[PDB]
Write a structure and sequence with these properties.
This is part of a larger assembly, with 2 copies of chain A, 1 copy of chain B, 2 copies of chain D and 1 copy of chain E.
Chain B (H helix, E strand, L loop, with lengths): L1 H10 L1 H22 L1
Chain D lengths: L1 H6 L8 H6 L10 E7 L1 H33 L1
Chain E lengths: L5 H12 L14 H15 L2
Classes of the chains: A mainly alpha, B mainly alpha, D mainly alpha, E mainly alpha.
């Protein structure tokens, strides 16, 4: 059951970071193109992923 | 049922309260910069 | 097992949480660089005024 | 008298500790007054006025470049 | 930061050009070993 | 008399609701707390009393700060009254003589 605990709160952090990734995709689409150049976050995501 | 929506809307409030206070500090800086 | 209006206010909160977050996103798109350019310009135009005054 | 009567009372739902502290946090006591911010829609209302005020500062710097183009020539 | 000596030079040319009782001839932009001489040629007047 | 009894209804809604008659009132206390923190919805707390209406003006709404604003420096004999219009400024400037006429007609 403790080997389940540490896997669960790990997966909670894993899932919370993927919600935070998908909010960048949700924000880039709602940003108008005349301001989409001001939103660095997709290039921050790809730099962090690399 | 309801209490799972409550405990999620705690975690989406203890989300948004931080963003509100950070964006309020950001606005209090940018009001002073434009003065 | 609740009064139906408490379901309707759970549905109202499921609208209101999105109305706060959509505006928290509209704010998270704003950029200071236009206001930083106002400070970039205030240095340059003071130096160009001094070249004019001293001449 | 108008300023002191306004500052004497915390605005609707502001805590008294935050309302009294915001009078010490105020960097110019006779040009500026503390004014609440409530919900993200007030922050956005400020940011849209900051955007339009930034443009109205820029439109005067643009003309200060023309005022200095008179001088240097 | 990236705000070089040209700011301070533009204020130095002013401190000269608001003390320069205007000649009919320009002044000479001394080499650094004439500058080192001019300072000491002047200090040797001042300390009398 | 109003505020004193509004505060008693709010304290009741946020700690001791009696709407449902079992453990569901303890979940209703959390529902009333959550609504008050978001500054929206309705603090239902007894079958004989209206709910506590919640706005972002309520004390427990967490989305509050204080910021800063300039005061006006023009004087009453300066006559300066501001009108904000549902119009773009290029329409206001091109209508400006018709607007002066219209404001003069609104001044009788």
């Amino acid at each position: 059951i403790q080997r389940n605990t540490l896997n669960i709160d790990k997966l909670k952090i894993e899932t919370a970071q993927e919600l935070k990734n998908a909010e960048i995709a949700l924000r880039t689409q709602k940003t108008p193109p005349g301001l989409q150049h001001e939103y660095a976050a997709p290039a921050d995501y790809f730099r962090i992923l690399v | 049922q309801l209490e799972s929506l409550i405990n999620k809307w705690s975690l989406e409030l203890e989300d948004q309260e931080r963003h509100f206070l950070q964006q309020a500090t950001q606005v209090n800086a940018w009001d002073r910069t434009l003065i | 097992n609740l009064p139906p209006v408490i379901c309707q206010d759970v549905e109202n909160l499921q609208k209101f949480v999105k109305e706060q977050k959509q505006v928290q996103e509209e704010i998270s798109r704003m950029s200071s660089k236009a206001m930083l350019k106002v400070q970039e310009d205030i240095k340059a135009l003071k130096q160009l005024l001094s070249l004019a005054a001293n001449g | 008298a108008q300023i002191k009567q306004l500052l004497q009372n915390p605005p609707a739902g502001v805590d008294p500790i935050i309302w009294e502290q915001a009078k010490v946090d105020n960097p110019d006591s006779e040009k500026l007054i503390p004014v609440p911010m409530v919900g993200f829609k007030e922050l956005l209302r400020r940011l849209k006025v900051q955007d339009q005020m930034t443009k109205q500062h820029q439109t005067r710097l643009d003309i200060i470049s023309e005022d200095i183009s008179e001088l240097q020539k | 930061d990236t705000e070089g000596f040209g700011e301070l030079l533009q204020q130095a040319e002013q401190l000269a050009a608001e003390t320069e009782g205007i000649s009919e001839l320009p002044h000479v932009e001394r080499n650094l070993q004439e500058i080192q001489q001019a300072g000491e040629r002047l200090r040797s007047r001042t300390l009398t | 008399p109003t505020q004193s009894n509004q505060l008693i209804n709010t304290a009741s809604a946020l700690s001791a609701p009696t709407l449902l008659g079992d453990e569901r009132d303890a979940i209703l206390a959390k529902w009333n707390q959550l609504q008050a923190f978001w500054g929206t919805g309705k603090g239902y707390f007894n079958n004989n009393i209206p709910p506590v209406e919640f706005t972002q003006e309520n004390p427990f709404c967490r989305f509050k700060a204080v910021g800063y604003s300039c005061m006006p420096s023009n004087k009453d004999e300066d006559g300066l009254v501001v009108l904000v219009f549902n119009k773009k400024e290029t329409e206001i400037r091109s209508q400006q003589q018709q607007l002066v006429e219209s404001l003069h007609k609104v001044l009788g």
